[PDB]
Every structure is written in structure tokens, then in C-alpha cells.
Design a protein around this ligand. Structure first.
Ligand SMILES: O=C(NC1CC1)c1ccc(-c2cnc3c(NCC4CCOCC4)cc(NC4CCCCC4)nn23)cc1
Length: 257
């Protein structure tokens, strides 16, 4: 403690997560209000790294107005030495919140989906495919879920999963559909209290089972029938037959009643 951004001044409560060359702190301002300041040290970074940071602020900045399911950015500061991002602070990141709760209320799981849908929808409209969606990328604030990063800059962890990795990702060694899958696996996890491949732990065989057509996934018949359809359409292995976000936003699960 403590941090100084564009004239304003903040004291550091906790360290939420770490990069990267980056650190996220939960942060208190003068008026006892809570915030999230991400700090990037730019001393040990090449032009490829630097430019991905500049691209991140640009897009976070740009997308402010287009959806209230993108983490708010209040102000920022960039020099040749450092970057600070003053953002809204979340209650709990979806990952840890899914770990804590045993069963999820349906009306609450549908609301988080609409929310996950709107966010991802928004980035796609500005030509961004996350490519690496995980519940760690989402956050709860004032009822809603909110996307926090864009897969543009290097991912951070709390202070290395592949459950959600799409089949076409690993098969190629650029498609909106890749996000649809990962959103599916998240919805799956919220539905069947597990990711679809949680059973396996050996990577070389897990990454192999994601892509394996012979490896059939379970969809235990559940009350909400719309929901069972979304998961199926979402977790098709073939990108071109997998449901799209616009389709997914027109689906009876999100639309009926
Ligand atoms: O870097 C971020 N976005 C990129 C620039 C476009 C970013 C990172 C974290 C937050 C944020 C705000 N509040 C919380 C937040 N709030 C929960 C706290 C609250 C007090 O108890 C501990 C958790 C958690 C949390 N979890 C971690 C961050 C590091 C990587 C994995 C996920 N992130 N977070 C917002 C933006």
C-alpha cells in the first residue's frame, strides 16, 4: 500500500490475483468505496506483450458503452513504466462461487446464462473471439454476471484447466463457435454439478477425449427440457453444426416464460 492513479489515491486491501507482469488488488479509495486496480509493470515486456496490453485497455474502454455485462473501467493510467486500470470490484468470481454452492437455483442459472450470452455476444460484435472462456473469466456484481477479460492479454490466476477447451482448438496445431462450446461447458457444470470431462484427469487422454466422437457425453434427463437442448446443441464437436450465439439468444431456454 498504497496506489496513486490520475490524481486520485487508493489503499490496498488485498491482492486478488497475479499475472503475468500484472497484479490485481482489491482496493479502497478515500470514500471507503471498494475497487479493483490492475497493475502492469512494463519494464520486462517485449512489443508483442506491450501491444496486447494496449489492445486490452482499448477494447475494455470501447466496450464499456455496449454492454453492462462487461466489467466497468472507471479510469486508467499508462506510461512507459507502468499501467493502472481502475475497475469495478466483484463480489465473487464465478469459479469459486460454483465451488461453494452445492445445487444452483434454476431461475439463477438461467439469468447467468443470459448474462454470459450478452457479454460474449457483445465481444463477437466487435470482432473478438475469447477462445479461452472459463468461469474464472466471469464475475458476480449487483445480481449479474460480467465478463472481465477478453483473452486478448495474458490470463491471471487467484492469490491450469482444459475442461472447457473446444475440440477445434486442439485439433488445429478463429471461430465464434469456440466460445459457444466453453459457454456450454460452463452451463453443463452449472447443470450437472461437473464439467463434461471432469471424470478424466490424465491430460493426454482428456485432450484426446474432448475430440473423440466415439466418446459420448452424458445428458441425464432433467426437468427443464429447453436446457437439455441448449447443452446438446452447445456441445456438438463440429463447429459448423454447433449452435451460434444469435441462435442461442433466440432459444426457448432464454426466451419462453
Ligand atoms: O484484468 C482484468 N480484466 C482485463 C483488463 C480486461 C480484471 C481482473 C480482475 C477483476 C476483478 C474485480 N473483482 C474481482 C474479484 N472479486 C472477488 C474478491 C473479493 C474479496 O474476496 C476475494 C475475491 C475476483 C477476481 N478473481 C480473479 C482475478 C485474477 C484471475 C482469476 C480471477 N477478479 N476480480 C476485474 C478485471
Amino acid at each position: 500500500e498504497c496506489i496513486s492513479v490520475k490524481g486520485r489515491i487508493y489503499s490496498i486491501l488485498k491482492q486478488i490475483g497475479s499475472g503475468g507482469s500484472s497484479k490485481v488488488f482489491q482496493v479502497l479509495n478515500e470514500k471507503k468505496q471498494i475497487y479493483a486496480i490492475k497493475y502492469v509493470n512494463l519494464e520486462e515486456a517485449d512489443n508483442q506483450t506491450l501491444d496486447s496490453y494496449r489492445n486490452e485497455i482499448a477494447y475494455l474502454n470501447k466496450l464499456q458503452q455496449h454492454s453492462d455485462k462487461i466489467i466497468r473501467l472507471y479510469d486508467y493510467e499508462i506510461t512507459d513504466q507502468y499501467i493502472y486500470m481502475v475497475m469495478e470490484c466483484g463480489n465473487i468470481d464465478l469459479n469459486s462461487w460454483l465451488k461453494k454452492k452445492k445445487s444452483i437455483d434454476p431461475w439463477e442459472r438461467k439469468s447467468y446464462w443470459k448474462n454470459m450470452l450478452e457479454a460474449v455476444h457483445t465481444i463477437h460484435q466487435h470482432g473478438i473471439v475469447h477462445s479461452d472462456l472459463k468461469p474464472a473469466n466471469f464475475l458476480i456484481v449487483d445480481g449479474m454476471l460480467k465478463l472481465i477479460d477478453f483473452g486478448i492479454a495474458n490470463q491471471m490466476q487467484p492469490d491450469g484447466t482444459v475442461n472447457y477447451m473446444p475440440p477445434e482448438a486442439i485439433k488445429d496445431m478463429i471461430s465464434p463457435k469456440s466460445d459457444v462450446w466453453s459457454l456450454g461447458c460452463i452451463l453443463y457444470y452449472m447443470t450437472y454439478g461437473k464439467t463434461p470431462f471432469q471424470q478424466i484427469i490424465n491430460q493426454i487422454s482428456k485432450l484426446h477425449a474432448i475430440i473423440d466422437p466415439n466418446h459420448e457425453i452424458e445428458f441425464p434427463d432433467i426437468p427443464e427440457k429447453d436446457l437439455q437442448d441448449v447443452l446438446k446443441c452447445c456441445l456438438k464437436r463440429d463447429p459448423k453444426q454447433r449452435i451460434s450465439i444469435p441462435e442461442l439468444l433466440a432459444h426457448p431456454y432464454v426466451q419462453i416464460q
